Symmetry: C3
Subunit: 199 residues, 3 copies
């Protein structure tokens, strides 16, 4: 036992966990814990759930390395219950690994990450994929997983054994949790970033 190594997905945790952050409100002083989020790129854009930031007077984001920024709401999307925040990027931002070439397969191992107790991670697999409810996008709508999904990780990341982003944990039929495919999450972010610059 002493010589060998335990089976673990701590690799994926090292790679993707730094990029997952907390999201707070700071009304007035009251500092509430809203939920989780995911740093997407060096520009300082972050994805989170719309419900998390719905009634937010002041939004604050806290990284696992100790840094704390104030974020501004770039824009949200009710249908997918997503929202994009923006923060000033001091030199060095941890970003969520993304592989646009990777094709998620049913059965894949996935870790769910978010802060309820500090950062927390649960393990499951991709239970199913397809489209659900109103699907204006025309593209695959949901991603199901038996990894525990709750408020504590709602808005957080869902990643494979490699650490690559598979989806965004969301709340929008028991024992199963849902995430928004990273391909759809990417597209929605871009359209929210671009259409945020509009009269």
């Amino acid at each position: 036992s002493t010589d060998e190594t335990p089976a673990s997905y701590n690799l994926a945790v090292r790679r993707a966990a730094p990029a997952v952050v907390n999201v707070y409100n700071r009304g007035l002083l009251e500092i509430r814990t809203l939920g989780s989020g995911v740093i997407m790129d060096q520009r300082g854009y972050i994805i989170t759930n719309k419900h998390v930031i719905n009634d937010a007077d002041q939004i604050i984001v806290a990284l696992q390395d100790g840094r704390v920024f104030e974020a501004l709401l770039v824009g949200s999307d009710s249908l997918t219950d997503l929202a994009v925040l923006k923060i000033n990027a001091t030199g060095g931002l941890p970003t969520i690994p993304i592989n646009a070439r990777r094709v998620p397969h049913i059965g894949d191992v996935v870790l769910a990450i978010g802060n309820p107790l500090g950062q927390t991670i649960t393990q499951g697999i991709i239970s199913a994929t397809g489209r659900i409810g109103l699907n204006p996008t025309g593209r695959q709508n949901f991603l199901a997983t038996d990894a525990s999904i709750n408020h504590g990780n709602s808005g957080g990341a869902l990643v494979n054994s490699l650490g690559e982003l598979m989806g965004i944990n969301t709340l929008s039929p028991e024992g199963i949790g849902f995430a928004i495919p990273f391909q759809l999450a990417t597209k929605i972010m871009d359209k929210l970033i671009r259409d945020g610059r509009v009269i």
Copy 2:
């Protein structure tokens, strides 16, 4: 990340999932979703739970490849809450992989498969094995697992990382799901097939 491969049990899914089917009723027109089932052999025999087909006027079975047959009830077994259906086998039927030589061990990884949301798969391990309640068979009665078992997969298959059949998800003490060992399920099917041909 781009080069390597994610840890996954999609192999087992490819092999065993095609064989797991939906089971409906078609009263009158009302088409209800009853539960799941498992194609066992080329002859077109299918195992499912007795509760699934208890009050069924007309039974219908739908494969993942798009085909839809009408099934007839070969016979059921109250003690194990199993039931065997029969369908006309057009050329080419997907059947559930079975290894009569394989000995299930506690700790083994297992996937639970069934259609609640479309086909769905959850992951767990064999938590325990033994005999429970009235045991006329004299042989091992149950197989416990922490893979989520629910109505949506009740009657579906339980398989290992290889795809080999370990048991039949059933409903007949919290956080744990149950399946009927494939060795017992086989024997019960045969006796229901044979004793179905009786005056």
Copy 3:
């Protein structure tokens, strides 16, 4: 399929499971099932939860190999809800593998073991680690995991793929179970053993 081998953690089960035992009370005759415990060393010391043995007139311990001893309460610790029992060690006692050099990492695979249905094992990962509530020890207080933790395994062991002891399942915020790090459990046991010899 026939040639290959299923993915399994039965190795860890073989190594650590024999050491996990049942704990009963024997009032008067009534024999109640209290919970689970863990043989720690050849001297015959066993760890269990304090709630398990709180109102115990006579304590009995049953191994998976068939042997049955009477245990005496060495002492307990309210803060960590632990308790140490002592039994006469006939030649040959199964003890829980321990690696004082092993550093638990988040994401590690872990099996939870205890007797509710006979011995049962569930699989999860180390979700988180840190310190919680009143922390007089100054050292890391808790270990979180998404392996199912319940009364049936409360007091039982939590081990990695190797079988090495990671913690003691305990009851002292949903979907997540807790265990006491084995490094803290060791220290508490020793202090209870030593300070048990006191006027």
